[PDB]
Design a protein around this ligand. Structure first.
Ligand SMILES: CCCCCCCCCCCCCC(=O)OC[C@@H](O)COP(=O)(O)OCC[N+](C)(C)C
Ligand SMILES: CCCCCCCCCCCCCC(=O)OC[C@@H](O)COP(=O)(O)OCC[N+](C)(C)C
Ligand SMILES: CCCCCCCCCCCCCC(=O)OC[C@@H](O)COP(=O)(O)OCC[N+](C)(C)C
Ligand SMILES: CCCCCCCCCCCCCC(=O)OC[C@@H](O)COP(=O)(O)OCC[N+](C)(C)C
Ligand SMILES: CCCCCCCCCCCCCC(=O)OC[C@@H](O)COP(=O)(O)OCC[N+](C)(C)C
Ligand SMILES: CCCCCCCCCCCCCC(=O)OC[C@@H](O)COP(=O)(O)OCC[N+](C)(C)C
Length: 582
């Protein structure tokens, strides 16, 4: 109201306010050191309490943008370090923040963050909790200027629980390390989803995003009326449009408004919200975004009575094409939360193609009469892929399932770099382990979720250093045909086997003494290289070599004087294997 800075402080609480201010600043002045930022926070934090005490103290009435920009233009070395960015300081408000927004750098040349020894962390944690966690909150925000501030903070608090528990378990690493790895993965999937959404929204336009939302909102709020889902689609689209654009405050107000609109109408939306709706403003929309689907209305009819039988199908359709198609997505989606969102859209695109071609022909009813039959194939291709992958995944276990994917893809696209094949087969291996333990009912949404980030990462890496037109064809295809396209890739027939190279297949004892999450990578690395050198090798001829290599690794690691065995026995594979596939 009179003072936006005080209202934020009374609303957030000192701790949250302090952490969000650090992130906000870390995201713009990425080259300042941690101690400069702790300095700002405290100055901004003391200034805010001035305002909390009396909303009429000087400057307390300025807008957050104006205050944030002024502080920003205060940094003495702004020009020295940021060049162009400092010229933003010569502008008037609306333009000035827009100017700062553009000079934000997604790829700063900062050194990767090296996870210290569990022991050094716990000790740092115990001796200086605040600085330990704040320093790392800073290191993460400066490296991710677009990661939405409050979610970044929701991750920070989970890193805090992780340390507070594990750092007294005596067998610390067993506790902490798995928790940290589970966190990095989420952190990465969340970040990659955000970019995915923003890039899709511009690569494919507002309509395709609204169709995606209708589907998603309907599985999620199946008892809501189509008019309520549409109102929520409209708002969800401004939110994402404004959050993609990047301005943290406008993005935060849009999300809060939506959340408060959702909580003021729970009855009209979902019976699952009462818990998310009583939480602090800071956590509200995030919680809602995470909510479990509401139980569907039990007895619901076939969509047949409104989309194929009833006269006026072409009439209600012509009248407002998208609204009608939206209703069909709504009715279909809400009946199927077992479906992935993109499947739902495959069906919508199918019905749309069919009403078009048909409504403008002899007998509408007798052209489009057989539309629901076209859904069946579409609905099982992914269903089957899940029955087979989760079953293959139970015979072999995680790591061998990863290896089976490794051989599959390498053959489909041998041109891809080994590090990319290895990291992709590994992550796709992790998606099976996750999603597969799930019941048939929640499996497809699970894999869609994860596959799209994996596939976009693979595409990005590929975009820079393009190496296969086919990957490229699948990568610049409709967001809906992406996975079907990759699943369509067949063994590459034109590929000429790679020139053999001994170095690549030579091993040493270091690997008897290397860690699991590191031994596997070299094994997986050589496996790929193996396939690339003898693509025609068969399931049996490969297993024979893989079994030899495992008896070759064991002999030179077990009951032996080691080292010399590896070059001796080693050359007795590179040539024995080389002829059992020659
Ligand atoms: C995210 C907020 C944490 C506060 C910063 C200090 C405490 C956090 C604990 C640090 C984790 C130590 C292990 C480690 O550093 O691994 C990952 C590093 O490569 C940095 O990346 P992550 O922090 O895993 O990912 C950033 C979190 N994201 C993905 C949500 C941005
Ligand atoms: C006011 C709010 C109301 C919401 C109603 C909007 C819903 C209408 C949806 C029509 C949906 C038909 C299904 C479908 O067409 O989805 C297509 C998208 O997934 C598009 O992916 P892209 O290749 O980027 O889009 C360009 C090509 N499309 C959009 C024509 C398929
Ligand atoms: C010495 C004078 C210095 C003046 C500096 C003070 C003004 C600068 C203020 C910068 C604004 C960034 C920090 C802040 O005040 O809050 C911004 C974020 O916390 C907004 O997030 P919230 O509104 O908590 O949204 C979280 C809930 N949502 C996401 C569902 C909306
Ligand atoms: C997890 C990301 C995709 C899931 C689909 C988003 C549909 C979720 C619907 C929540 C319905 C109410 C939305 C809400 O009230 O939140 C406003 C939002 O911005 C919530 O964000 P979402 O689009 O759910 O995604 C969270 C942000 N991410 C996903 C881009 C990281
Ligand atoms: C470089 C390597 C090449 C890449 C190969 C991509 C192939 C991955 C196919 C993965 C199969 C194992 C995962 C699984 O459990 O499958 C689930 C799917 O088959 C079903 O997902 P869908 O509903 O089709 O998800 C939508 C597909 N989109 C969103 C990616 C277009
Ligand atoms: C053309 C020239 C041929 C040269 C021969 C090199 C071929 C080797 C390349 C890949 C090797 C096979 C990769 C693989 O499948 O990993 C083997 C693992 O499944 C098991 O191997 P080991 O570590 O010996 O067994 C222990 C299993 N662990 C992991 C539980 C310890």
């Amino acid at each position: 109201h009179k003072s936006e800075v005080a209202h934020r402080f009374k609303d957030l609480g000192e701790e949250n306010f302090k952490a969000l201010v650090l992130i906000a600043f870390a995201q713009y002045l990425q080259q300042c050191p941690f101690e400069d930022h702790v300095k700002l926070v405290n100055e901004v934090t003391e200034f805010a309490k001035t305002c909390v005490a009396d909303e009429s103290a000087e400057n307390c009435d300025k807008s957050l943008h104006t205050l944030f920009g002024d502080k920003l233009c205060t940094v003495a070395t702004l020009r020295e370090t940021y060049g162009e960015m400092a010229d933003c300081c010569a502008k008037q408000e609306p333009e000035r923040n827009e100017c700062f927004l553009q000079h934000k750098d997604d790829n700063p040349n900062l050194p990767r963050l090296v996870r210290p020894e569990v022991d050094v962390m716990c000790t740092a944690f115990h001796d200086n909790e605040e600085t330990f966690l704040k320093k790392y909150l800073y290191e993460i925000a400066r490296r991710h200027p677009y990661f939405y501030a409050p979610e970044l903070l929701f991750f920070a608090k989970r890193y805090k629980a992780a340390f507070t528990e594990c750092c007294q378990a005596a067998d610390k690493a067993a506790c902490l390390l798995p928790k940290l790895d589970e966190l990095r993965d989420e952190g990465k999937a969340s970040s990659a989803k955000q970019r995915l959404k923003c890039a899709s929204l511009q690569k494919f336009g507002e309509r395709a995003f609204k169709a995606w939302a209708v589907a998603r909102l309907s599985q999620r709020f199946p008892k809501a009326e189509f008019a309520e889902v549409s109102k929520l689609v409209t708002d969800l689209t401004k939110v994402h449009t404004e959050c993609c654009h990047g301005d943290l405050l406008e993005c935060a107000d849009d999300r809060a408004d939506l959340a408060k609109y959702i909580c003021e109408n729970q009855d009209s939306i979902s019976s699952k919200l009462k818990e998310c709706c009583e939480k602090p403003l800071l956590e509200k929309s995030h919680c809602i975004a995470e909510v479990e689907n509401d139980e569907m209305p039990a007895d619901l009819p076939s969509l047949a009575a409104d989309f194929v039988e009833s006269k006026d199908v072409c009439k209600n359709y012509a009248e407002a094409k998208d609204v009608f198609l939206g209703m069909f997505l709504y009715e279909y989606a809400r009946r199927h939360p077992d479906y992935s969102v993109v499947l739902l859209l495959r069906l919508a695109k199918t019905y749309e193609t069919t009403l078009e071609k048909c409504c403008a022909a002899a007998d509408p009813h007798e052209c489009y009469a057989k539309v629901f039959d076209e859904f069946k194939p579409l609905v099982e291709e992914p269903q089957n892929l899940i029955k087979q992958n989760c079953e293959l995944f139970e015979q072999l276990g995680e790591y061998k399932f990863q290896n089976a994917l490794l051989v599959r893809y390498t053959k489909k696209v041998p041109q891809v770099s080994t590090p990319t094949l290895v990291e992709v087969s590994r992550n796709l291996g992790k998606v099976g382990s996750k999603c597969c333990k799930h019941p048939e009912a929640k499996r497809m949404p699970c894999a869609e979720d994860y596959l799209s980030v994996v596939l976009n990462q693979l595409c990005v890496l590929h975009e820079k250093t393009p190496v296969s037109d086919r990957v490229t064809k699948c990568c610049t295809e409709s967001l809906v045909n992406r996975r079907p396209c990759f699943s369509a890739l067949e063994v590459d027939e034109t590929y000429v086997p790679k020139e053999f190279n001994a170095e690549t297949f030579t091993f040493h004892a270091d690997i008897c003494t290397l860690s699991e999450k590191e031994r596997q990578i070299k094994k997986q690395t050589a496996l790929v290289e193996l396939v690339k050198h003898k693509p025609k090798a068969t399931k049996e001829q490969l297993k024979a070599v893989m079994d030899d290599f495992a008896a070759f690794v064991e002999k030179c690691c077990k009951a032996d004087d080691k080292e010399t065995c590896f070059a001796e026995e080693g050359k007795k594979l590179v040539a024995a294997s080389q002829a059992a596939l020659g």
